[PDB]
């Protein structure tokens, strides 16, 4: 396989389905990336993550640079070897979680104290190299919401200068430039002119893929969709479109309808350890007393191993008892459900019936 | 298969190897039973428990009678169905954990408040029936250590009266008497005459197997072995001998040398979530800094899936980070190590070289 090749096999409106080919594997799009925090997809062996259908996972840089450390992971053979996942890994660039979980900002980057460290475009790209990332994200600033037009502009402009620094850092590292891909991140808050300026700046630098940054930061679904409506068409059509940090099943469906190809979210893993299970009839909270004697599986149609073997009653008991096996089973089912959703999306676009699928999905889920 | 058949295939000194055949499966002896607390072997799917080599697991009655409740588990189809383990389950009778984890004692049984309930020989045997246990333990009193000869005698006498009540309760329940086995429990503290009286009482009532109760209660290995030396030969030779709550690998080896056939302990699961890993060169604590860059597996010879795939360095990181996957991997390795120990014990007895194995095992483990 090539370092990076994105092919679009079918389209419906703004929605696309196709493949990203990389050295470590093929990614079917639209894609959902389970999140590995601290070098593990919580409560799952990598083989289980792959059995759910995942083609790629996301690695969080902030946690890994703190523990176990990026240089240590490189000394040990890289993140793939370390955690036992041999397919593609997308790594975030670290600043979103620095600003949410740990700080002093400047044009150079951000200094912060672990919940002292520094993060600059150059150091972010180097950490992602030391981890052995397949898809490297540019170092950006996720503008807070709401933002004034002046502050959104100033923030977006900084991120575009950092995008250029990220590009040059990545390109200066032969092994990284030859084997990995680099994605740029559009900013601009909710403002169409700033989103356009950001798209133009990123296309002029040139990236393998383009993320829509700065969303899912409290603006709500209607506003996120309004911004996606004008923002995604600004990005190069022939490269993947990644919506960072999204999201709930209905957010994914509407984002695909607006041209997004890639997603990640801690919702299925996080909320699964919490007791929320996704089903085609909407989410349920398995801790509710109504499930204490329910012998049905979490979802009536789900093909995952959890729904083949255990009841709602048993998983209700495990989560109420705080048992590790409850987090394992809930997480496997929820990531399998997300992957089945992505498969249904890909098949319906391929068959020119995605509009119908989206409508049917929502009528039943809600 | 029969309800219960114990066959001895080979002997060496007091050590025996053979099989227990039951309706739900064959148990190879000497056997180690992983412990299921609250209807789960912590951090393992049942398929993983079976992949380590386990033929039978232990179900704790005290926890299950409190949550989810024994009548609820019966309504749901029994413990096997509920947790997804279709092979034999041995259930404890509940009083050991009542006295350690929750009480008013009388000749009728014990009343206690959940960390209000009652437990009598008749109710214990009924709870084990409602769970669908394959091997039912008699309801006993684990005498505290140290005990005076008067108190040990009074306690042992009560337990033998409860043993008779347990036998009659079990026999009065046709479905239970036809499909399950019943084990009696010898008491008597460290006193040879009381151990003999207890063995005589239990053999006169008649059981499918005999446990050595009242040990591993703080007397220490030398004293436990001294009591096993005279106590195990008192029990019927042609039935299984079960040493409750034991134990560390060296305790198991010496107990087999003294005629024990069955074991259970939370050590491998419990201590695995804590960071202790068993190895043929003795235990290690994977949280120690020395393992942070160690690429070797937990044990150099272990055949388990964890040692095939992940390093000490990765498991060190997971346990230090409090990640669920660290408890999963440590638990699978430690239960696999215990099962490999039991396999080595069974093969060495079968080959008339267990004495040599015990000596070699200790020289290297210590
Ligand atoms: C860390 C890489 N950059 C980067 N990550 C993000 C992660 C997000 N996660 C959410 N909601 C869960 N919104 C995000 C926006 C960004 C964003 O604008 N930038
Ligand atoms: C609950 C069934 N009866 C019963 N369980 C026990 C469990 C033990 N566990 C240990 N050390 C970990 N000693 C024990 C003695 C008994 C015992 O004398 N009786
Ligand atoms: Zn499922
Ligand atoms: Zn192992």
Residues A187, A204: Cα–Cα separation, whole Å: 15
Count CB neighbours of A337 within 10 A: 28
Q: Torsion angle of alpha carbons B105, B107, B111, B117, nearest 10°? A: 160
Resolution, given in Å to one decimal, reads: 1.4
Reading the block at residue B95, the tokens are 């009083």
Rounded to a whole number, what is the distance in angstroms from the first to the last CA of chain B?
Answer: 42
Main-chain dihedrals φ then ψ at residue B171, nearest 5 degrees:
-70, -25
Q: Identify whether the C-beta of residue B264 lies closer than 8 Å to the C-beta of residue B54.
A: no
Does ligand 2 lie within 6 Å of residue B93's CB atom? yes
The 8-class DSSP code of residue B269 comes to I
Main-chain dihedrals φ then ψ at residue B37, nearest 5 degrees:
-110, 135
Exposed/middle/buried for B223, CB within 10 Å: 0-12, 13-18, 19+? middle
Q: Between the CA of residue B107 and those of A47, A108, A298, B155, B160, what are the distances in Å?
A: 54, 78, 46, 10, 11
SS (H, E, C) A270-327: HHHHHCEECCCCCCEECCCHHHCCCCCCCCCCCCCHHHHHCCHHHHHHHHHCCCHHHH
Count CB neighbours of B237 within 10 A: 12
Q: Torsion angle of alpha carbons A300, A301, A307, A311, nearest 10°? A: 0
Estimate the crossing angle of helix A312-320 against helix A324-350, to 10 degrees. 130
Q: How far is the CA of B348 from the centre of ligand 2 (A)?
A: 28
Structural domains counted in chain A: 1
Rounded to a whole number, what is the distance in angstroms from the first to the last CA of chain A?
Answer: 42
Residues 66-125 of A with CB under 8 A from B: 67-68, 72, 75-77, 82-84
Q: Locate tokens 């594997």: which residue?
A: A25
The DSSP H or E segment spanning A21 is strand A15-22
> Is the CB of residue B309 less than 8 Å away from at least one CB of chain A?
yes
For every residue of B155-204, DSSP letters joined together read HHHHHHHHHHHHHHHHHT-HHHHHH-EEEEEE--TT-HHHHHHHHHHHHH
The edge-to-edge listing of strands for the beta sheet with A104-105 is A104-105, A110-112, A117-119
Residues A17, A357: Cα–Cα separation, whole Å: 14
SS3 category, B273:
helix
- For residue B30, cis peptide bond before it (omega within 30 degrees of 0): yes
Give ligand 1 pocket residues (Cβ under 6 A).
Answer: A 92-96, 137, 140, 142, 185, 213-217, 244-245
Of the candidates B84, B295, B318, the beta carbon closest to that of A309 is on B84
Of the candidates B67, B82, B323, the beta carbon closest to that of A314 is on B82
Q: Identify whether the C-beta of residue A194 lies closer than 8 Å to the C-beta of residue A212.
A: no
Q: Identify whether the C-beta of residue A63 lies closer than 8 Å to the C-beta of residue A97.
A: yes
Count CB neighbours of B172 within 10 A: 11
Task: Calculate how close chain B gets to A314, using CA atoms only, in Å.
Answer: 6
Radius of gyration of chain B (CA): 20
Q: Locate tokens 């004008």: which residue?
A: A230
Reading the block at residue B311, the tokens are 């390093």
Q: Identify whether the C-beta of residue A266 lies closer than 8 Å to the C-beta of residue A35.
A: yes
Ligand nearest to the CA of A299: 3
Secondary structure of chain B: what % helix, strand, coil (to 5)?
A: 45, 20, 35
Count CB neighbours of B225 within 10 A: 16
Please pick, among A55, A251, A261, A264, the residue that the annotation labels catalytic.
A264
Residues B147, B168: Cα–Cα separation, whole Å: 29
Residues A299, A303: Cα–Cα separation, whole Å: 9
For every residue of B16-61, DSSP letters joined together read EEEEEEETTEEEEESEEEPEESSSSBTT--HHHHHHTT-S-EEE-H
Q: Locate tokens 């009242």: which residue?
A: B214
Which approach determined this entry? Answer: X-ray
Residues A91, A282: Cα–Cα separation, whole Å: 30
Q: Identify whether the C-beta of residue B302 lies closer than 8 Å to the C-beta of residue B315.
A: no
Does ligand 2 lie within 6 Å of residue B98's CB atom? no
Q: Between the CA of residue B350 and those of A148, B40, B346, what are the distances in Å?
A: 80, 33, 6
| CATH classification of the domain holding A163 | 3.20.20.105
Instruction: Kindly list the residues from chain B whose CB atom is less than 8 angstroms away from the CB atom of residue A292.
Output: 68, 72
The 8-class DSSP code of residue A41 comes to B
A261 annotated as ligand-binding: no
SS3 category, A85:
coil
- The domain in which residue A265 lies consists of 1-366
A265 annotated as ligand-binding: no
Selected residue of A289, A296, A328, A333 to mutate for chain B interface (largest B Cβ count, 10 A): A328
Task: Calculate how close chain A gets to B49, using CA atoms only, in Å.
Answer: 12
What residue of A is the nearest CA neighbor of B293? A76
């Amino acid at each position: 396989r090539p370092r990076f090749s994105f092919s679009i096999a079918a389209r419906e409106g703004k929605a696309r389905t196709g493949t990203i080919e990389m050295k470590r594997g093929v990614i079917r799009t639209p894609a959902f990336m389970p999140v590995g925090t601290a070098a593990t997809v919580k409560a799952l062996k990598p083989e289980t993550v792959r059995a759910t259908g995942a083609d790629i996972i996301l690695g969080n840089t902030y946690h890994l640079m703190l523990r176990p450390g990026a240089e240590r992971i490189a000394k040990l053979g890289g993140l793939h070897s370390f955690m036992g996942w041999d397919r593609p890994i997308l790594t975030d660039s670290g600043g979103y979680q620095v600003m949410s979980l740990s700080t002093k900002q400047s044009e150079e980057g951000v200094t912060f104290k672990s919940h002292r460290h520094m993060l600059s475009p150059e150091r972010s790209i180097e950490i992602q190299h030391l981890l052995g990332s397949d898809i490297v994200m540019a170092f950006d600033e996720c503008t807070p919401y709401p933002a004034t037009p002046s502050r959104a502009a100033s923030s977006m402009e900084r991120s575009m200068r950092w995008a250029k620094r990220s590009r040059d850092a990545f390109d200066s590292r032969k092994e990284q430039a030859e084997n990995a891909a680099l994605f740029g991140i559009q900013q601009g808050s909710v403002f169409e002119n700033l989103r356009q300026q950001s798209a133009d700046a990123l296309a002029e630098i040139g990236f393998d893929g383009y993320a829509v940054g700065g969303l899912a930061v409290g603006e709500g679904q209607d506003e996120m969709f309004r911004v996606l409506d004008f923002s995604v068409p600004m990005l190069p059509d022939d490269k993947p479109h990644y919506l960072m940090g999204v999201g709930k099943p209905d957010d994914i469906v509407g984002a695909v309808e607006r041209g997004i190809d890639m997603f990640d979210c801690v919702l299925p893993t996080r909320s699964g350890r919490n007791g929320q299970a996704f089903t085609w009839d909407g989410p349920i909270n398995i801790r509710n007393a109504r499930f204490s004697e329910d012998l049905k599986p979490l979802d009536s149609e789900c093909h995952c191993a959890v729904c083949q073997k255990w009841s709602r009653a048993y998983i209700h008991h495990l989560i109420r008892a705080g048992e590790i096996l409850g987090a394992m089973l809930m997480t496997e089912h929820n990531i399998a459900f997300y992957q089945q959703l992505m498969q249904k999306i890909r098949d319906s676009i391929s068959e020119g019936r995605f509009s119908q699928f989206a409508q049917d999905f929502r009528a039943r889920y809600f």
